[PDB]
Nucleic acid binder design. Structure first.
Ligand SMILES: [K+]
Ligand SMILES: [K+]
Ligand SMILES: [K+]
Ligand SMILES: [K+]
Ligand SMILES: [K+]
Ligand SMILES: [K+]
Ligand SMILES: [K+]
Ligand SMILES: [K+]
Ligand SMILES: [K+]
Ligand SMILES: [K+]
Ligand SMILES: [Mg+2]
Ligand SMILES: [Mg+2]
Ligand SMILES: [Mg+2]
Ligand SMILES: [Mg+2]
Ligand SMILES: [Mg+2]
Ligand SMILES: [Mg+2]
Ligand SMILES: [Mg+2]
Ligand SMILES: [Mg+2]
Ligand SMILES: [Mg+2]
Ligand SMILES: [Mg+2]
Ligand SMILES: [Mg+2]
Ligand SMILES: [Mg+2]
Ligand SMILES: [Mg+2]
Ligand SMILES: [Mg+2]
Ligand SMILES: [Mg+2]
Ligand SMILES: [Mg+2]
Ligand SMILES: [Mg+2]
Ligand SMILES: [Mg+2]
Ligand SMILES: [Mg+2]
Ligand SMILES: [Mg+2]
Ligand SMILES: [Mg+2]
Ligand SMILES: [Mg+2]
Ligand SMILES: [Mg+2]
Ligand SMILES: [Mg+2]
Ligand SMILES: [Mg+2]
Ligand SMILES: [Mg+2]
Ligand SMILES: [Mg+2]
Ligand SMILES: [Mg+2]
Ligand SMILES: [Mg+2]
Ligand SMILES: [Mg+2]
Ligand SMILES: [Mg+2]
Ligand SMILES: [Mg+2]
Ligand SMILES: [Mg+2]
Ligand SMILES: [Mg+2]
Ligand SMILES: [Mg+2]
Ligand SMILES: [Mg+2]
Ligand SMILES: [Mg+2]
Ligand SMILES: [Mg+2]
Ligand SMILES: [Mg+2]
Ligand SMILES: [Mg+2]
Ligand SMILES: [Mg+2]
Ligand SMILES: [Mg+2]
Ligand SMILES: [Mg+2]
Ligand SMILES: [Mg+2]
Ligand SMILES: [Mg+2]
Ligand SMILES: [Mg+2]
Ligand SMILES: [Mg+2]
Ligand SMILES: [Mg+2]
Ligand SMILES: [Mg+2]
Ligand SMILES: [Mg+2]
Ligand SMILES: [Mg+2]
Ligand SMILES: [Mg+2]
Ligand SMILES: [Mg+2]
Ligand SMILES: [Mg+2]
Ligand SMILES: [Mg+2]
Ligand SMILES: [Mg+2]
Ligand SMILES: [Mg+2]
Ligand SMILES: [Mg+2]
Ligand SMILES: [Mg+2]
Ligand SMILES: [Mg+2]
Ligand SMILES: [Mg+2]
Ligand SMILES: [Mg+2]
Ligand SMILES: [Mg+2]
Ligand SMILES: [Mg+2]
Ligand SMILES: [Mg+2]
Ligand SMILES: [Mg+2]
Ligand SMILES: [Mg+2]
Ligand SMILES: [Mg+2]
Ligand SMILES: [Mg+2]
Ligand SMILES: [Mg+2]
Ligand SMILES: [Mg+2]
Ligand SMILES: [Mg+2]
Ligand SMILES: [Mg+2]
Ligand SMILES: [Mg+2]
Ligand SMILES: [Mg+2]
Ligand SMILES: [Mg+2]
Ligand SMILES: [Mg+2]
Ligand SMILES: [Mg+2]
Ligand SMILES: [Mg+2]
Ligand SMILES: [Mg+2]
Ligand SMILES: [Mg+2]
Ligand SMILES: [Mg+2]
Ligand SMILES: [Mg+2]
Ligand SMILES: [Mg+2]
Ligand SMILES: [Mg+2]
Ligand SMILES: [Mg+2]
Ligand SMILES: [Mg+2]
Ligand SMILES: [Mg+2]
Ligand SMILES: [Mg+2]
Ligand SMILES: [Mg+2]
Ligand SMILES: [Mg+2]
Lengths: 79, 97, 65
RNA sequence: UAGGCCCAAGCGACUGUUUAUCAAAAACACAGGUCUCUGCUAAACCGUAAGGUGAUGUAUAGGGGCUGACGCCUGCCCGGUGCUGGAAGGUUAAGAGGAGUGGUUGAAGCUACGAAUCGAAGCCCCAGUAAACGGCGGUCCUAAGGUAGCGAAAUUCCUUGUCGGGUAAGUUCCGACCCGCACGAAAGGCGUAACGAUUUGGGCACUGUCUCAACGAGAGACUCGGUGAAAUCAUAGUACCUGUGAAGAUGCAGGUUACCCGCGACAGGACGGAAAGACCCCGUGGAGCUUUACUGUAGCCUGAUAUUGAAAUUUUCUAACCCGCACCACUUAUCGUGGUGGGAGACAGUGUCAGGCGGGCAGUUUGACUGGGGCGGUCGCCUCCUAAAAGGUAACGGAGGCGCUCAAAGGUUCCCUCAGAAUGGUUCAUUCAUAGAGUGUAAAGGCAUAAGGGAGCUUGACUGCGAGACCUACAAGUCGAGCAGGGUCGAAAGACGGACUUAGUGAUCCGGUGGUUCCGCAUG
RNA sequence: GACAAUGGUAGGAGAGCGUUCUAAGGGCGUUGAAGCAUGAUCGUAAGGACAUGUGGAGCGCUUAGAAGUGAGAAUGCCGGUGUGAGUAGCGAAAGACGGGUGAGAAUCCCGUCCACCGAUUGACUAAGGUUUCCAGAGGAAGGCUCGUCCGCUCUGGGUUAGU
RNA sequence: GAGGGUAGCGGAGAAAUUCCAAUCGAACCUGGAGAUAGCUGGUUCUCUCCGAAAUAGCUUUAGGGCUAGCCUCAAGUGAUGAUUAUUGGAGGUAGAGCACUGUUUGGACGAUUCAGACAAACUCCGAAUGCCAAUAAUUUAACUUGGGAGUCAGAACAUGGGUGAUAAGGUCCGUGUUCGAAAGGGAAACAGCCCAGACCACCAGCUAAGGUCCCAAAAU
RNA sequence: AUCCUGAGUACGACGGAGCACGUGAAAUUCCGUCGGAAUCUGGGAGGACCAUCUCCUAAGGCUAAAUACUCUCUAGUGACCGAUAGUGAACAGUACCGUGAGGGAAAGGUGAAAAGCACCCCGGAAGGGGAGUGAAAUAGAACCUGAAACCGUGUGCUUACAAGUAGUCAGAGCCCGUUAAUGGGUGAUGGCGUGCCUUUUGUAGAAUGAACCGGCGAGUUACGAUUUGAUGCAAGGUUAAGCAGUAAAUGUGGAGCCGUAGCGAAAGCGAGUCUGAAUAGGGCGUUUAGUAUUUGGUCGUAGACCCGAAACCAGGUGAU
RNA sequence: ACAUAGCAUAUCAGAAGGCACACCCGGAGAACUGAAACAUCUUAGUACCCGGAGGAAGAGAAAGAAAAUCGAUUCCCUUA
RNA sequence: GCCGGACCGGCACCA
């Protein structure tokens, strides 16, 4: 007969990218959900208390290289 | 009924109370006061007679929406500040009765 | 006979000008040490009955205007 | 027409009784035994009561429990439960009692509460009680660890135990052994003559039970005259084989076979007829039953108070109340009602209120998931893999963690850089060392901008918010720039609305506490 | 006129057919209404006509209104009639022949012989039934066949108490 | 034998759940009463247009229900929908590799080095795809608000995986198709495979899958 | 106001009950038990309670009308039934069933008029064939009409080598001749072809249901809600009960209801308001359309689409 | 003891029982059911049973409603 | 939680 000691999992947190490179976003739009800095805050982008990356102004999202092994996301005004 | 899930009106809290002595007034605006000619004395009886006010409630309150454009002596139970100012500034007068 | 109002619901909602129902918020009775300051501050603010819930419960408050 | 008999074993002593209609028995009863209650208006029982049964009886009697003639006997345990008896030490209700507090009008008054203290039974405690409920293990422990007798048994799982007898051959039987899975002394132990439509083994007699069937008689069947139903039934001109198919085909495919219609026969199929499967599961279905399930309740016990009085200090008295107590009358009357004596007596009974006991009786509850159900496991939250390089994604798939902690382990400014190894020294020093350390805690993602280490100051682990987003059926959950009010650190730019991030939680209703430019039922 | 669309369960939407009743209008009918029956008729469907026969007194059409408004299934309810089928059965047993009656006789009556019960298949009380008792007449149905017979049908009768 | 008595929350019981008027774990009759039935069965004329679902979440919930998803009807809005091309991006699978963690086989040297292998929870690396967006070609939706639903048993096949045994016409998820709700041709017959979507009529024609000796159309 | 004006009363405590109101801050009314006032300078009520004010005057009784019902009677009515309907009952609480309480049917129609068939014939009769009556007797009493299942008689085509959901498409032969239509009946022979309903992932299914035929047999109505269509009026819209009228339309009736203003728990303020210290920000609002009646759809309360439990309770009937 | 109870007589005829007992007043009073279980609650003071009457019954002449005042009871509309 | 002894013992307990 027997039984299993497993069978547990937490709810999935729906992390990852929320806006695309080259997309226009209003200020405050969440750009990236993550644990830790998998992607860094770049220009006009903030990092929240739970590592969320969000736009500080309205503009266009740009995911870019940051050094050799890191990356960042910025937001540039359309003008 | 939600099939045994706690219903919305049980999961939300009750709020507030009903005032037993609550007063509600029949409201007349200045654009409604336009109907009468200049120099007329407006009373609650006159308002009910001409049909502007259907039910008197706890009294008659004059409110400041719209434009008056007439000179009147308005006798009512309550006036808003803007309604009183507009009545007085159009050449007329108001009195709380 | 006349339809009966749902008395608990009538004690919990109010009717807005456009026909919406203003409601209070759950999680506002106790255990406030287990909730953040922002959580309680924003739970202080009222919301509306959602559209799906309204589809379910409209007839319970038909007389409540 | 009229007993078959014998040997041996289990059970029950015996005659009797029982499931009308599948059980007649080893079950019930029984005479006998024992325990217990009961002093008579007995106890017990029926009834709301009156009235009754018990009994026109009176402890050699009546009710209840268990055992079950008779013979020999019936061992240990009173820790637990029940029962019996103590004690008034603690705990508790009505009721008594009023310290005191508030509301209102400087009071009183009215009003809402209200604390010492008193206040029974029960329970907690002690003792006894086992033919009371029960228990009679695994140096250790217990209340105590099975006496006599019996034992592979109506009890023995292994098991057809082993040995002997009976047979040519015996899983049954009889006799022994004891290793009693899991006998055992009145839910009685071991025996027992007689008895049994009882169960079991053996033998004689006897036979169509059988080897192995044959013949004969009669009633049906069968033919004719008369009379004439029924269950069933989608329509039917209703073949077989191999296959196909909801996985077992008269009816589909491909073959094979078969001229049309009766009658007597047989039962392989028509998953044949019959009864909306009794098994099994499911329904927030029902019913009967149980109890240390929940909530009640008939009834019983106990206290206060009313009926309910009079004197001493529990005792006394008589006059209310009571007598299924005697005599007398109504009255040819074991009812009743009055009268007189006697008994008892402010008790009892009864009413109201209170506390306790109360499967005697009642209403109900007693989850779901599940490779059927039960049993086991699981049930919310966090992290990883499965998960197919966005997100999401299941199984009783594979691994772990959480229901906190920290007054700094928070904020800010400044400074600093680790593990390991080798080499020398009775932790100290040098060089390699991108982290191979540390990060409160599980994992993953991050971090030497350090998010890791230390130091000074400090309390932003603020108040009112909040454009805009993420997540999402809802209720919830998450991030958030900026704005204002006041601060902390820093020279300053600036940072700070707890913690490297992600678990550490629980709705509503109701109640408690603090505040309150709110309401407050004619007015205050 | 030239292009497109039109499989469909649960289900949504639309347009219609037919039934009964009502209002108003307009009609049919003993020179034959409704209903029923038959036909080789018409419309995209539900359905609508016509002709003939039967029937014997009511009934269409138009517009609108209102509904007990449409059945093939509920082991549906009621009624009728099949199938099984000339099949099972005809309910413990001894009858035979002669004579009679009669439309008709195994079955009724008479006779002879035979057979069965006889601690009873005999005889008498009670309960229960309630006219079944008797006579004459009858034979549709009842009688498990038949029936001239009967506990059946018709008519008329019958029960007498001081013990 | 006769005459009587005990009655259903009850009687009676030498005790069997036994009997109380042919079925007693609580008789029968009438009434409350059309109890309740998240269950089974049934639900009656026609044609036309559209046309699902068998999923998620929560549920004393699991063959029930609610909200969402998918259908329909009507109003609105108006490029916001679909596909492809180009361009930009997020991410760690296939494969590969051993730089970390772990596993492992031979050498050599005084643990290091050399060579060679293994991994869902290893990664110095890393596709094809798929996804998110931006402005050209093609295309026809898309969204909002209201009225009305049904669905919450799914099945096979192919493929990426778990589980089982690289068993099952097994089971649980991802992806696509078909059945469901789809007739027609093929696969002998054969829901789920292959071809292909039936408005009606024709004794016209061309093809698909599959076929062309006879059954049986077309090549001995 | 000298005297009187309802005493075991009012009231209170405890336990209950009735009040829309479940003991609640519970006023007001009643019952049981126990206690227990005052006396116009009094007493009660105004939702705990106190004070003030206001209203009233318990513990005695009587009292028509507007209201409720229908086994009845009289006079009438119906977009109610028309013999399986409508009462169970058009001819019955009968027949029949049960010990009993109790359950409980079936069954209407000749014809205008009985003129209900004199008489003859077969037959014991029954029943027939004539003859008569009648407009009609296949209107002859088992009587209007006379469907279907089912049972028979006659025969135009066809059938005894054939394997079948019985048809359909093709098709000779034979027989007929119409609502006259590129007709009717039958059918050698060839192709194709496993009923219907329900329930299902999937049913020829060997899963369910139906012997056949006929009749009967299931989303209705009332009152509310919401939405859509229609119509009237429009910053307005509309009456309810009642009264009048013919059981009508309608007239009258403006009480009331929905709109014209929202926001707030509330006091309140008001085109704003709430939050807030804020002249900030944010929520809900303003920046015209409603209302009455009604067709359709859907929901709620009612049994609510129909049939079906095992059971529960109450009052009776049974020991033949 | 007196009386009373009791026992006879004489006169009267008051009660009894029935119903459409439908409606009404009073006593007493369920359960299935709903709450998606169930006990408070609901079904419901309903069904049933019992008593008493009338053409009606019940209520009725303020120790009332109220907050500007009204003026017995009952019933209809509305409040809702 | 209320109280008596040294936690024990009774009582109380309707989000
Ligand atoms: K005794
Ligand atoms: K003891
Ligand atoms: K499973
Ligand atoms: K994943
Ligand atoms: K007799
Ligand atoms: K839905
Ligand atoms: K490696
Ligand atoms: K009280
Ligand atoms: K009454
Ligand atoms: K329920
Ligand atoms: Mg932080
Ligand atoms: Mg944080
Ligand atoms: Mg015996
Ligand atoms: Mg015997
Ligand atoms: Mg038996
Ligand atoms: Mg027997
Ligand atoms: Mg015994
Ligand atoms: Mg002891
Ligand atoms: Mg002893
Ligand atoms: Mg065993
Ligand atoms: Mg024993
Ligand atoms: Mg002993
Ligand atoms: Mg013993
Ligand atoms: Mg014994
Ligand atoms: Mg023998
Ligand atoms: Mg024979
Ligand atoms: Mg024979
Ligand atoms: Mg015969
Ligand atoms: Mg098939
Ligand atoms: Mg197969
Ligand atoms: Mg076969
Ligand atoms: Mg074949
Ligand atoms: Mg045969
Ligand atoms: Mg069978
Ligand atoms: Mg069944
Ligand atoms: Mg019980
Ligand atoms: Mg119940
Ligand atoms: Mg289960
Ligand atoms: Mg299992
Ligand atoms: Mg992917
Ligand atoms: Mg992913
Ligand atoms: Mg765990
Ligand atoms: Mg835990
Ligand atoms: Mg820190
Ligand atoms: Mg007051
Ligand atoms: Mg006040
Ligand atoms: Mg098509
Ligand atoms: Mg179509
Ligand atoms: Mg429709
Ligand atoms: Mg239509
Ligand atoms: Mg029509
Ligand atoms: Mg009908
Ligand atoms: Mg039928
Ligand atoms: Mg037959
Ligand atoms: Mg024969
Ligand atoms: Mg036969
Ligand atoms: Mg035969
Ligand atoms: Mg025979
Ligand atoms: Mg015979
Ligand atoms: Mg005899
Ligand atoms: Mg006779
Ligand atoms: Mg005969
Ligand atoms: Mg006779
Ligand atoms: Mg039995
Ligand atoms: Mg038993
Ligand atoms: Mg017996
Ligand atoms: Mg019986
Ligand atoms: Mg009921
Ligand atoms: Mg029913
Ligand atoms: Mg379509
Ligand atoms: Mg790989
Ligand atoms: Mg499968
Ligand atoms: Mg497989
Ligand atoms: Mg799939
Ligand atoms: Mg389906
Ligand atoms: Mg197909
Ligand atoms: Mg499709
Ligand atoms: Mg094949
Ligand atoms: Mg084929
Ligand atoms: Mg198909
Ligand atoms: Mg060709
Ligand atoms: Mg060919
Ligand atoms: Mg009072
Ligand atoms: Mg008085
Ligand atoms: Mg008829
Ligand atoms: Mg009738
Ligand atoms: Mg005729
Ligand atoms: Mg006729
Ligand atoms: Mg031939
Ligand atoms: Mg041949
Ligand atoms: Mg064929
Ligand atoms: Mg199946
Ligand atoms: Mg078959
Ligand atoms: Mg079935
Ligand atoms: Mg059948
Ligand atoms: Mg039928
Ligand atoms: Mg409905
Ligand atoms: Mg409706
Ligand atoms: Mg709905
Ligand atoms: Mg009467
Ligand atoms: Mg319930």
């Amino acid at each position: 007969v027997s039984s299993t000691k497993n069978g547990r999992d937490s709810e999935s947190k729906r992390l990852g990218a929320k806006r695309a490179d080259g997309q226009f976003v209003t200020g405050g739009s969440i750009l990236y959900r993550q644990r830790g800095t998998k992607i860094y805050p770049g220009e006009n982008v903030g990092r929240g208390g739970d590592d969320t990356l969000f736009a500080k102004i309205d503009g266009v999202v740009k995911f870019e290289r940051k050094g050799r092994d890191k990356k960042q996301v910025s937001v540039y005004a359309v003008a | 009924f939600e099939g045994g899930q706690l219903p919305l009106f049980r999961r939300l809290p009750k709020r507030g109370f009903t005032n037993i002595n609550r007063k509600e007034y029949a409201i007349v605006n200045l654009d409604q006061l336009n109907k009468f000619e200049d120099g007329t004395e407006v009373t609650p009886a006159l308002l009910v007679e001409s049909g502007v006010v259907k039910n008197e409630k706890s009294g008659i309150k004059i409110l400041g929406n719209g434009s008056l454009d007439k000179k009147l002596t308005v006798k009512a139970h309550k006036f808003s500040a803007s309604a009183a100012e507009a009545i007085d500034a159009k050449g007329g007068a108001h009195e709380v009765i | 006979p006349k339809m009966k109002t749902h008395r608990g619901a009538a004690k919990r909602v109010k009717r807005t000008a456009s026909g919406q129902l203003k409601r209070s918020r759950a999680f506002t009775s106790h255990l406030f040490a287990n909730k953040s300051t922002k959580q309680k501050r924003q739970l202080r603010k009222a919301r509306l009955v959602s559209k799906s819930d309204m589809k379910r419960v409209k007839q319970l408050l038909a007389y409540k205007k």
